[PDB]
Design a protein around this ligand. Sequence first.
Ligand code: HEC
Ligand code: HEC
Ligand code: HEM
Ligand code: HEM
Ligand code: HEM
Ligand code: HEM
Ligand SMILES: CCCCCC[C@H]1C(=O)O[C@H](C)[C@H](NC(=O)c2cccc(NC=O)c2O)C(=O)O[C@@H](C)[C@@H]1OC(=O)CC(C)C
Ligand SMILES: O=C1C(O)=C([C@H]2CC[C@@H](c3ccc(Cl)cc3)CC2)C(=O)c2ccccc21
Lengths: 244, 244, 383, 383, 54, 85
Amino acid sequence: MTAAEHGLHPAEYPWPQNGMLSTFDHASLRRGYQVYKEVCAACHSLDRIAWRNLVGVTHTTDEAKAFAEELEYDDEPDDEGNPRKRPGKLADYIPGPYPNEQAARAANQGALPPDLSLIAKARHGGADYIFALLTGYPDEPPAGVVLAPGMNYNPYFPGGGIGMARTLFDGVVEYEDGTPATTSQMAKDVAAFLTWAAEPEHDERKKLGLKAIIVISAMLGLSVYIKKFKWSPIKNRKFIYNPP
Amino acid sequence: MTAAEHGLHPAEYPWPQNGMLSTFDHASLRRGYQVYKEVCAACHSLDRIAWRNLVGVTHTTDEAKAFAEELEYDDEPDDEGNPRKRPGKLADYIPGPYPNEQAARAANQGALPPDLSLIAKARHGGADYIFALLTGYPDEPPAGVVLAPGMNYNPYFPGGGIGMARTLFDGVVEYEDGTPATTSQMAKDVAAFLTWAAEPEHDERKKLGLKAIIVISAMLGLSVYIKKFKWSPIKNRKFIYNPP
Amino acid sequence: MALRKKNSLLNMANSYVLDSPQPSNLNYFWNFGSLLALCLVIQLATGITLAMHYTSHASLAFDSVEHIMRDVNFGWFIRYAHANTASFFFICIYAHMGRNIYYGSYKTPRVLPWSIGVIIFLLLIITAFMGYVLVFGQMSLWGATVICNLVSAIPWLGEDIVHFLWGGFSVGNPTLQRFFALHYLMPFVLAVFALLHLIALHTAGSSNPLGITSNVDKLSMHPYYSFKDLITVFAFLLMFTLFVFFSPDKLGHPDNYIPANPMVTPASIVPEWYLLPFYAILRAIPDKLGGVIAMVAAILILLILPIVDRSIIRGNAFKPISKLLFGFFICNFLLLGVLGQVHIEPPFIVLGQICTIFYFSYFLILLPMVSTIENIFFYIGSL
Amino acid sequence: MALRKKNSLLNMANSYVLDSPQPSNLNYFWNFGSLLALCLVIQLATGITLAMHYTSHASLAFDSVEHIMRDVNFGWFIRYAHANTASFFFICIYAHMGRNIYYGSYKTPRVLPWSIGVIIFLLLIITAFMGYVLVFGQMSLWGATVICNLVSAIPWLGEDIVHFLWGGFSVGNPTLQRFFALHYLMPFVLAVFALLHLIALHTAGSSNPLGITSNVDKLSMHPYYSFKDLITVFAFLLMFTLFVFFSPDKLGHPDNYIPANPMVTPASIVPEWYLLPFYAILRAIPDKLGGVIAMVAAILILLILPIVDRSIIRGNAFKPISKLLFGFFICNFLLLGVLGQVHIEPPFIVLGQICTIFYFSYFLILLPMVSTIENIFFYIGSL
Amino acid sequence: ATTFYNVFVKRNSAFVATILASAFVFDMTFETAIDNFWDRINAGKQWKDIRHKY
Amino acid sequence: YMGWWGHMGSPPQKGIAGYTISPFAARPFAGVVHAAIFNTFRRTKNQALFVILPVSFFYYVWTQASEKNEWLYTKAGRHELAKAL
Ligand code: HEC
Ligand code: HEC
Ligand code: HEM
Ligand code: HEM
Ligand code: HEM
Ligand code: HEM
Ligand SMILES: CCCCCC[C@H]1C(=O)O[C@H](C)[C@H](NC(=O)c2cccc(NC=O)c2O)C(=O)O[C@@H](C)[C@@H]1OC(=O)CC(C)C
Ligand SMILES: O=C1C(O)=C([C@H]2CC[C@@H](c3ccc(Cl)cc3)CC2)C(=O)c2ccccc21
């Protein structure tokens, strides 16, 4: 295909989590949540993440309970069977900005902002694609590109014309840890956070894999010793032939 | 248990559908629907029956479309993602009187009127139980029975005290076929209708069973001829023994 | 040499269904084995078909069964066929175990097929039960609760196992989905074991109603028993047809057409007709662990028939006293069945206990004693 | 006589896993059989476990897979293990069929295990595919559409069959629930066939890398090949671990993490890495029915290797020309794989067609010709 | 009678063809016959019998 | 313990001549009337007590228990039920 139609392939950034023994940087996850909450959540849902999922990853139990308790969720009907709301609990899912797809499209000049819970797994490139996309809006589209109405030029998005405008600008978030909130810093943080969102088991998975690699390596070494040992009578077998 | 705790066992009424080769009387089914619609539907849902299920059983396609089209059902949201209603179609389910259990209980002094789609299969006795129950409210409870508040005495219901009051009285329905709407007639019709509701395949089932009984009988007869035929060399085998 | 003998694959089929040498005098009670095979085939066909339509999620399970009844073409047939064949499977399997106990099929050299059979019997119970739960009606949910709490009898770890088998604090969605997985699986395991007990039997060959060797007089499995087995296939299908088409709910509990409500259990708790004997056993014993042990032991005790039958003669055709004892044992097992479905009230509480003692005393006391005495009566009586 | 030989059940196990006489010189390519057995065991364990957590209803399926990833303890492992082992299963099965083609395992007297094997290969494709669909992501839904429409190729009835398979007018809930049923079932059928092709092989015994008789020099399956198979078990688990724990999504398509939207087909449609060779075949042929036939024929044509290999010598160890031809055939099969995942653009359209012709010409032209010529070269060359 | 045996029964190909063609005829006629019988025993009961009113 | 055709493991047989006729030559239902009536009566009579004795005893036991149970839950059976509990 044309380069345009593919999208530019994102650079491979050296994420903290790249590397067989490397976890996410949880400080970055926390910062990235704050970017999601203050920028992306206006348009994008994170439906597959519950408040409890943040606990002991980015936030303490108490901070996440505070986030849940600020919201109202549908309770069971009252005793007259009238609908009720309750304050959120940790088992509740982070609520979306829009009640349905149609409302989402209405607010976005027809384009549907995807759920971000899985977006790091759902696109070639993963974290790198999210970081490249968020930071990759040129001030001017390359000469000759005709954007469809309500599209913005972003080379990383296939086709070039993405319905999402540039949204990260220096100091749209004020980080609570005093980190300078530059476009690149916020994109890295939110990209990390979203990658965690997509694969939250990541840290545990790599640790168990480390233990497995070690055990399985040792067992493979020993199994080869044992095989050679048991086979040595056959390998070492010698014949004397006296034709009868 | 005491008789009270069991409930009186209902009489075995000679329903049209009793009998291996007997269908429902569809005229009775239609009359019974009219009883459900005009009496029972105030309190009881029939959630498992769709308008299309009445078609070619009790009503023509057109009459059932007319019933569906009188109601409003939840449509897909409009283009701004605002909720909408549409007129009912034949695939829609007959809607309940109450939005939830709690609203049902609120309207029934705490008691929950069960869904009637399955009630003929869900109670020992089936049609007979429904007919016995609906017609079996004595004018006076047997001397000595203490009813709990908001309970009505009905011997067929286990415990004796049922939260459903007597509801069929001579001429609460005006049948469209000019049949005298007596308590017994309406109970028989609605009991038949509910039995159909629980087992709508009844008519087809018994017909296929008739064909199966005939084929399987013939095959059983022939299989016995063939077995005897093939075994006759062994059965007819004779021995002569000459001790050596 | 005939292809059927030459080719390794055909030769295995041949050895089971065609050339297999069978005694020439097997009576109609030898037909249950093939009916259980037919039930197993019907159950697999209807079962896999229901699995194409059934949804294991607790919010949808009961409704998916109603959808099967109402919307799926012939869904009613497939559902009732599956449910009813589960009942016929148990009639046939009690018949088959009956036949085996009466004709001493459990004695050497057939202890192995017998003992594998006892495991098939346990697996059938667990399969059929796991399948009962999938409807997620009232009885379904309660049955799940009780069966998954039989492991609470196991001390210390017991309570935790219960929670582990429920995947929750109560029977709920998790439980229903894991019962679906296992109910689909268990029948294939059961077909393996059914095959294995035949392979174990193939060393000795079938017993016969005289209990003598049949090595003197064998008949090929086909055509003789193939055609003999068709008679019962058609007789079975006649009975199947009468239930499936004419009275599909006679063998069912009304309460299972009520969706599962974890807040109430029906006042009239009565399990499947085939579990009733062991349920009465469980009710009889007033101890938790006791009740469970007795109920499981009622099946596992069949494993000791090879030991406790001390007869020098195989099976009961020729033993008037053993036949009478077997008659009382069978009728007692039916009485237990009956007591399983009355209310837990006087005088049936004491009666159920007496029947439970009689059930166990057949294996532990009466059979060993009667079989010893009849040995002596044969020897003295024929001198 | 040893119990393992006396007892009928043990004797069957014994004959397969312990006393089974194997040639003494099987090399590491004889290890794929047991790896495929291990894959099959892993798939059954993880599969049945996912079935305890997965909900087949289209409204819930994708979400139940996310719930498995996120909420179920070790769900991530079980899911990725199941998904990755499906890839390893195909690496091993191509390796295993590779081994068989290179060493002439398809020749007499092993045509039967070979031919049963070809059916196992088709069943694996259908199993793994039906399994792909259960996620009900974007690639899943489209995959379902495509495969059920391969029956549309069949004229007249074809189109009605498609609707019958879907249970609808499109792939939807009905389809997904029936794929769940059959995906659970298909692996047990596949384990039967895997067992059968071993039983068929047990008449001739394993071939060996020299292609000579091994009747002169046999070695018990255990301990020698048991311990030899452990080496590859651990080597397999090392590779499994690297994928499952470190890169679980390397072998996956991102688009399957988008829920199924029947309105849009991903611009970049590319199936599982293992179906790619036949997908390129399907893309190559411009006719509908042609494309389908060719794709199926690419598997079924393996059935004719027993006929078209005219060699008097079993396998390729000693045939330089055949080894070169086999090298080009394998590389062409890998090229087809590669062309399966490029865009349908020049010049790869023509290239894919040339590779498709080369694929078929190996069975129809080259193998018969080369094998004939090498026969003559052996005879003349040794005179 | 020999003739009938020779034509329809002697060759198994012919016998199986005859059985399947008879099964076809039986299947079609049995269906029709039971349909009519079922309508006669349940006369005035079934939807087809009251449909005319609407 | 059982062999296969040719080596079934019968003690050597000698001196038994077995004769049978073709299924086509025999009437498969010959003497069916006689058998259905007289033979089945014979076989039923000989086994009757083995069924009748346990069925009649356990039917008696059930009958007594069900009648007592019924009676205990009447007004007349109030006192005997109070003792039983
Ligand atoms: C006010 C709107 C809006 C805001 C703010 C917004 N987005 Fe989006 N986003 C969209 C829309 C609309 C699309 C769909 C674009 C399309 O498909 O043409 C989208 C698409 C995306 C995509 C995927 C594009 C693709 O490959 O399909 C990612 C990833 C993304 N957004 C992440 C973010 C992150 C991270 C933020 C902020 C930190 C963010 N978005 C802020 C509206 C928004
Ligand atoms: C205004 C209320 C009301 C009307 C009208 C009503 N019911 Fe009910 N019905 C109930 C309530 C409440 C119960 C629950 C009683 C209880 O469980 O104590 C009930 C219970 C039943 C039951 C089952 C009782 C049981 O066994 O659980 C059936 C059957 C039934 N109704 C059928 C009907 C039919 C048929 C009609 C009219 C043709 C009807 N009902 C009219 C309120 C009503
Ligand atoms: C799925 C369930 C089962 C099937 C399909 C099955 C099938 C069979 C078959 C076909 C036979 C040989 C023919 C026959 O005697 O009827 C047989 C024999 C036998 N079965 Fe079963 N069986 C099953 C369950 C059981 C159970 C639960 C037991 C024991 C508790 C059992 C014990 C035996 C024994 C001991 C034999 C040898 C009996 C003899 O021929 O004397 N089987 N079974
Ligand atoms: C021995 C084999 C089997 C037995 C004894 C058995 C028994 C049962 C029983 C008793 C039920 C309850 C039926 C009801 O009351 O509705 C049931 C339900 C079910 N069975 Fe099976 N079953 C068997 C095999 C299978 C198999 C192989 C499948 C394959 C999936 C299966 C799938 C189902 C399903 C989906 C249900 C629930 C839907 C329903 O209730 O009808 N069964 N089974
Ligand atoms: C579930 C998949 C399969 C399993 C588990 C399996 C397993 C095995 C095993 C254990 C052996 C004996 C040891 C060995 O040679 O590696 C074997 C041999 C064989 N398999 Fe497979 N197999 C499978 C699929 C296939 C397929 C797809 C084919 C052919 C297309 C095939 C054809 C053969 C042949 C021809 C042999 C004899 C080869 C020889 O030893 O020379 N198998 N298989
Ligand atoms: C040869 C054996 C098997 C193969 C090759 C196979 C292959 C697959 C594949 C490729 C998937 C898609 C996985 C994904 O991308 O998420 C899958 C999913 C699934 N398989 Fe299997 N499978 C096998 C056996 C089984 C068995 C025995 C079960 C028993 C139910 C099973 C249950 C599932 C379930 C529930 C899913 C969907 C959940 C998921 O995607 O992880 N599989 N299978
Ligand atoms: C347990 C009783 C049932 C018998 C079947 C069990 C398994 C069985 O036969 O195991 C054997 C170990 C067999 N390998 C060989 O023949 C073998 C022969 C020569 C060389 C090597 N390796 C070289 O270095 C071998 O590995 C094997 O891996 O075959 C599995 C597939 C079988 O499972 C099944 O078919 C059932 C199902 C799980 C597929
Ligand atoms: O209380 C019980 C109960 O006890 C069983 C019982 C009876 C048979 C038992 C059993 C018998 C034999 C074996 Cl080998 C294992 C379990 C299983 C539990 C049920 O099936 C049941 C179903 C529905 C509601 C309540 C109940």
